[PDB]
PDB file of C-alpha atoms and ligand atoms in Angstrom:
ATOM      1  CA  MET A1430      98.527 136.611 119.597  1.00 53.98           C
ATOM      2  CA  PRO A1431      98.362 135.629 115.880  1.00 52.06           C
ATOM      3  CA  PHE A1432      95.553 133.416 114.579  1.00 55.28           C
ATOM      4  CA  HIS A1433      98.313 131.264 113.086  1.00 56.30           C
ATOM      5  CA  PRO A1434      98.170 127.693 114.520  1.00 60.88           C
ATOM      6  CA  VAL A1435     101.303 126.669 116.434  1.00 62.47           C
ATOM      7  CA  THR A1436     104.044 129.296 116.648  1.00 61.56           C
ATOM      8  CA  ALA A1437     106.568 128.729 119.445  1.00 62.28           C
ATOM      9  CA  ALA A1438     106.212 127.522 123.036  1.00 63.92           C
ATOM     10  CA  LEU A1439     109.901 127.944 123.856  1.00 66.56           C
ATOM     11  CA  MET A1440     112.178 130.966 123.361  1.00 72.23           C
ATOM     12  CA  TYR A1441     112.335 133.314 126.350  1.00 74.80           C
ATOM     13  CA  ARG A1442     114.133 136.307 124.837  1.00 74.06           C
ATOM     14  CA  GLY A1443     117.754 135.659 123.917  1.00 76.60           C
ATOM     15  CA  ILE A1444     117.170 133.771 120.675  1.00 75.74           C
ATOM     16  CA  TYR A1445     116.958 134.437 116.932  1.00 76.43           C
ATOM     17  CA  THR A1446     113.874 132.546 115.738  1.00 76.69           C
ATOM     18  CA  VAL A1447     115.035 128.971 115.154  1.00 77.19           C
ATOM     19  CA  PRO A1448     113.329 126.363 117.409  1.00 76.30           C
ATOM     20  CA  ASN A1449     114.673 122.963 116.331  1.00 75.80           C
ATOM     21  CA  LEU A1450     116.603 123.455 113.089  1.00 77.50           C
ATOM     22  CA  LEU A1451     119.579 121.520 114.463  1.00 79.43           C
ATOM     23  CA  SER A1452     117.579 118.297 114.793  1.00 80.77           C
ATOM     24  CA  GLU A1453     115.314 117.946 111.754  1.00 81.31           C
ATOM     25  CA  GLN A1454     114.658 121.533 110.650  1.00 83.86           C
ATOM     26  CA  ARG A1455     112.484 120.810 107.623  1.00 82.92           C
ATOM     27  CA  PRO A1456     109.366 118.683 108.396  1.00 78.52           C
ATOM     28  CA  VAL A1457     108.627 115.462 106.507  1.00 80.96           C
ATOM     29  CA  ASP A1458     105.026 114.936 105.405  1.00 80.95           C
ATOM     30  CA  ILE A1459     103.376 114.623 101.993  1.00 81.23           C
ATOM     31  CA  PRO A1460     100.911 117.515 101.383  1.00 82.36           C
ATOM     32  CA  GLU A1461      97.200 116.789 100.879  1.00 85.19           C
ATOM     33  CA  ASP A1462      98.070 117.366  97.210  1.00 87.26           C
ATOM     34  CA  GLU A1463      98.556 113.589  97.090  1.00 86.58           C
ATOM     35  CA  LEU A1464      95.357 112.868  99.017  1.00 87.59           C
ATOM     36  CA  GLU A1465      93.169 114.487  96.355  1.00 88.51           C
ATOM     37  CA  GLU A1466      94.547 111.854  93.980  1.00 88.91           C
ATOM     38  CA  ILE A1467      93.020 109.070  96.071  1.00 91.42           C
ATOM     39  CA  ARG A1468      89.480 110.295  95.413  1.00 93.34           C
ATOM     40  CA  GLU A1469      89.673 111.171  91.709  1.00 92.91           C
ATOM     41  CA  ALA A1470      90.943 107.605  91.222  1.00 92.85           C
ATOM     42  CA  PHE A1471      88.431 105.142  92.692  1.00 92.60           C
ATOM     43  CA  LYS A1472      85.796 107.851  93.141  1.00 89.58           C
ATOM     44  CA  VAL A1473      85.361 108.430  89.396  1.00 93.95           C
ATOM     45  CA  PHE A1474      84.959 104.687  88.816  1.00 96.40           C
ATOM     46  CA  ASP A1475      81.802 105.082  90.903  1.00 96.57           C
ATOM     47  CA  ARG A1476      79.160 105.207  88.167  1.00 98.55           C
ATOM     48  CA  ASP A1477      76.438 105.941  90.734  1.00 98.84           C
ATOM     49  CA  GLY A1478      78.577 108.630  92.345  1.00 98.16           C
ATOM     50  CA  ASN A1479      76.723 107.800  95.559  1.00102.69           C
ATOM     51  CA  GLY A1480      80.118 107.887  97.245  1.00103.81           C
ATOM     52  CA  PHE A1481      80.447 104.106  97.362  1.00100.28           C
ATOM     53  CA  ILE A1482      81.977 101.607  94.936  1.00102.89           C
ATOM     54  CA  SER A1483      80.245  98.290  94.251  1.00100.99           C
ATOM     55  CA  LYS A1484      81.789  95.077  92.904  1.00102.87           C
ATOM     56  CA  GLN A1485      80.785  95.590  89.262  1.00100.48           C
ATOM     57  CA  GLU A1486      82.209  99.112  89.559  1.00 96.06           C
ATOM     58  CA  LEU A1487      85.465  98.106  91.244  1.00 97.00           C
ATOM     59  CA  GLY A1488      85.878  95.552  88.471  1.00 97.68           C
ATOM     60  CA  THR A1489      86.351  98.474  86.104  1.00 97.33           C
ATOM     61  CA  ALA A1490      89.021 100.004  88.333  1.00 95.70           C
ATOM     62  CA  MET A1491      91.325  96.972  88.442  1.00 99.12           C
ATOM     63  CA  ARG A1492      91.118  96.324  84.690  1.00101.01           C
ATOM     64  CA  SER A1493      92.279  99.913  84.189  1.00 99.36           C
ATOM     65  CA  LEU A1494      95.591  99.050  85.840  1.00 96.57           C
ATOM     66  CA  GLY A1495      95.759  95.929  83.695  1.00 99.97           C
ATOM     67  CA  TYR A1496      94.046  93.392  85.944  1.00102.22           C
ATOM     68  CA  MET A1497      90.650  92.300  84.612  1.00101.46           C
ATOM     69  CA  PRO A1498      88.759  90.407  87.374  1.00 99.64           C
ATOM     70  CA  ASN A1499      85.947  87.934  86.740  1.00 98.52           C
ATOM     71  CA  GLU A1500      82.464  88.043  88.249  1.00 93.49           C
ATOM     72  CA  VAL A1501      83.857  85.433  90.644  1.00 92.73           C
ATOM     73  CA  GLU A1502      86.949  87.418  91.664  1.00 92.75           C
ATOM     74  CA  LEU A1503      85.641  90.992  91.993  1.00 92.97           C
ATOM     75  CA  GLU A1504      83.473  89.518  94.763  1.00 91.18           C
ATOM     76  CA  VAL A1505      86.375  88.366  96.953  1.00 97.27           C
ATOM     77  CA  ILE A1506      88.325  91.570  96.323  1.00 98.78           C
ATOM     78  CA  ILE A1507      85.549  93.883  97.528  1.00 99.12           C
ATOM     79  CA  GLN A1508      85.261  92.031 100.851  1.00 98.10           C
ATOM     80  CA  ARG A1509      88.922  92.849 101.480  1.00 99.87           C
ATOM     81  CA  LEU A1510      88.212  96.574 101.693  1.00100.82           C
ATOM     82  CA  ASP A1511      84.611  96.339 102.882  1.00104.07           C
ATOM     83  CA  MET A1512      85.290  95.574 106.549  1.00101.55           C
ATOM     84  CA  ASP A1513      81.918  96.825 107.799  1.00100.73           C
ATOM     85  CA  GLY A1514      80.115  94.683 105.231  1.00101.41           C
ATOM     86  CA  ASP A1515      78.004  97.160 103.260  1.00101.48           C
ATOM     87  CA  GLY A1516      78.634  95.620  99.849  1.00 99.52           C
ATOM     88  CA  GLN A1517      80.566  98.730  98.840  1.00 98.26           C
ATOM     89  CA  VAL A1518      83.853 100.401  99.780  1.00100.04           C
ATOM     90  CA  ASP A1519      83.925 103.715 101.650  1.00101.60           C
ATOM     91  CA  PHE A1520      86.477 106.495 101.137  1.00101.70           C
ATOM     92  CA  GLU A1521      87.893 106.273 104.677  1.00104.06           C
ATOM     93  CA  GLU A1522      88.485 102.510 104.527  1.00102.28           C
ATOM     94  CA  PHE A1523      90.455 103.025 101.304  1.00100.30           C
ATOM     95  CA  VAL A1524      92.164 106.234 102.473  1.00102.00           C
ATOM     96  CA  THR A1525      93.794 104.526 105.460  1.00102.02           C
ATOM     97  CA  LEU A1526      95.149 101.538 103.535  1.00102.42           C
ATOM     98  CA  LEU A1527      96.451 104.054 100.993  1.00101.98           C
ATOM     99  CA  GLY A1528      98.727 105.570 103.620  1.00104.17           C
ATOM    100  CA  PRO A1529     101.052 104.423 106.460  1.00105.59           C
TER     101      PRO A1529
HETATM  102 CA1  LIG B1882      78.142 103.205  93.322  1.00107.35          CA
HETATM  103 CA1  LIG B1883      83.023  99.145 103.192  1.00106.03          CA
END
């Protein structure tokens, strides 16, 4: 058997090589090529690079898009992502809300 993950569970003998090309054929799913964009974005704004983004740091991210938040606003925006309550936002928390 090939080390290749997932090959074909069906197909007894009398069959070309097509499994389900009459239903969907080509699969629909954005390649991780888009995921790497998630990091480089908010991750670079992390001046400490500790892997977490604080309020003062996140305040530099929003302004970049064209939304400059005040010292009073960047506080309520960070609590929207920070569900665990660590003062900073973790990759995962932001990676899920970035997708379906
Ligand atoms: Ca930081
Ligand atoms: Ca958090």
